[PDB]
Amino acid sequence: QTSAVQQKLAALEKSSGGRLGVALIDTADNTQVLYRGDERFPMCGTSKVMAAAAVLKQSETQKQLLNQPVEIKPADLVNYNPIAEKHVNGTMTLAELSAAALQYSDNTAMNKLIAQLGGPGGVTAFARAIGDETFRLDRTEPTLNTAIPGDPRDTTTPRAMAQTLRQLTLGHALGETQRAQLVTWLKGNTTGAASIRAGLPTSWTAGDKTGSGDYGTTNDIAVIWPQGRAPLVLVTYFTQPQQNAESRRDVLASAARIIAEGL
Numbered sequence: 727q728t729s730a731v732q733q734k735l736a737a738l739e740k741s742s743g744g745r746l747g748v749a750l751i752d753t754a755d756n757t758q759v760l761y762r763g764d765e766r767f768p769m770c771g772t773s774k775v776m777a778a779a780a781v782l783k784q785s786e787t788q789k790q791l792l793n794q795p796v797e798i799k800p801a802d803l804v805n806y807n808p809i810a811e812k813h814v815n816g817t818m819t820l821a822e823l824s825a826a827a828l829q830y831s832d833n834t835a836m837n838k839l840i841a842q843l844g845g846p847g848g849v850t851a852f853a854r855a856i857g858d859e860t861f862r863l864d865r866t867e868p869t870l871n872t873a874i875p876g877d878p879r880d881t882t883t884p885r886a887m888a889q890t891l892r893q894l895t896l897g898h899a900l901g902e903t904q905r906a907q908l909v910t911w912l913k914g915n916t917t918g919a920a921s922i923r924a925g926l927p928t929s930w931t932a933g934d935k936t937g938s939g940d941y942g943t944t945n946d947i948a949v950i951w952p953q954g955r956a957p958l959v960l961v962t963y964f965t966q967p968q969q970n971a972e973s974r975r976d977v978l979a980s981a982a983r984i985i986a987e988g989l
């Protein structure tokens with residue numbers, strides 16, 4: 727079948743010139759709205775949530791892990807290091823690296839999270855451990871953001887990512903203290919105002935993690951607390967056919983607005 731919201735998302739996609747994937751979970755009744763919900767999309771920076779969560783999980787059995795210093799060398803710097811660049815020849819704790827990766831989308835910080843987990847496969851193993859059989863991280867930063875059409879590397883589906891984000895932020899995939907830390911980090915994101923959040927009623931609160939890459943790949947995943955109602959989880963992925971396509975955060979905002987209006 728095809729619902730009204732699904733029809734509106736289809737119209738948005740057609741006018742956009744790209745491919746749109748959406749997954750909503752409304753925890754008020756556990757109902758879902760999917761659009762290309764089982765198609766694979768490049769995650770880009772949205773994968774940073776899985777890496778941070780995996781390190782939080784490790785910290786459950788090490789009350790001091792988040793305070794562990796990690797050396798940042800000049801050679802470690804990649805293509806987007808707004809926080810790490812200030813700490814070259816110094817150190818950052820895993821908590822600092824998690825906050826930098828999530829709230830500033832720092833790619834060098836993400837690489838340190840991946841390294842702590844033993845490589846991209848370590849992040850994938852954590853995803854499997856919490857019931858996500860779809861997610862796959864294959865590369866480090868920044869090549870995990872190449873976003874080449876058809877490439878299965880570093881992809882997931884909207885359905886899978888929404889279910890996992892729910893488990894992490896609203897469920898029991900993490901311990902209570904760790905879940906609160908993850909939510910606090912997401913709510914403090916600095917990069918998300920033009921994406922999902924731009925399509926929501928002003929009064930609503932949210933935590934999100936953006937992603938972007940080649941092929942005008944423009945992503946966002948969010949946990950939303952609408953004013954006076956049970957939280958939602960929303961994933962919006964978008965990618966385009968030309969390598970040099972422009973970013974389209976307005977498409978994500980439009981998708982979120984359609985979703986919000988349809989509740």
Ligand SMILES: CO/N=C(\C(=O)N[C@@H]1C(=O)N2C(C(=O)O)=C(COC(C)=O)CS[C@H]12)c1csc(N)n1
Pocket residue numbers: 770771772805806831833868869871872917935936937938939940941942
């Ligand atoms: C080889 O890697 N290529 C990247 C890339 O590093 N994407 C990563 C990603 O996701 N990040 C986000 C992100 O979270 O969206 C921002 C956020 O940007 C700002 C200013 O907030 C900065 S770029 C980084 C890329 C990005 S766009 C494009 N053509 N390529």
Ligand SMILES: CO/N=C(\C(=O)N[C@@H]1C(=O)N2C(C(=O)O)=C(COC(C)=O)CS[C@H]12)c1csc(N)n1
Pocket residue numbers: 805806936937938943944945972973974975
């Ligand atoms: C000359 O371009 N250099 C880029 C680059 O491709 N940036 C692109 C661009 O502008 N985009 C926008 C944008 O148009 O605003 C956003 C905004 O947020 C999202 C989600 O797209 C994310 S980055 C992407 C780059 C990537 S990493 C690095 N150090 N430089």
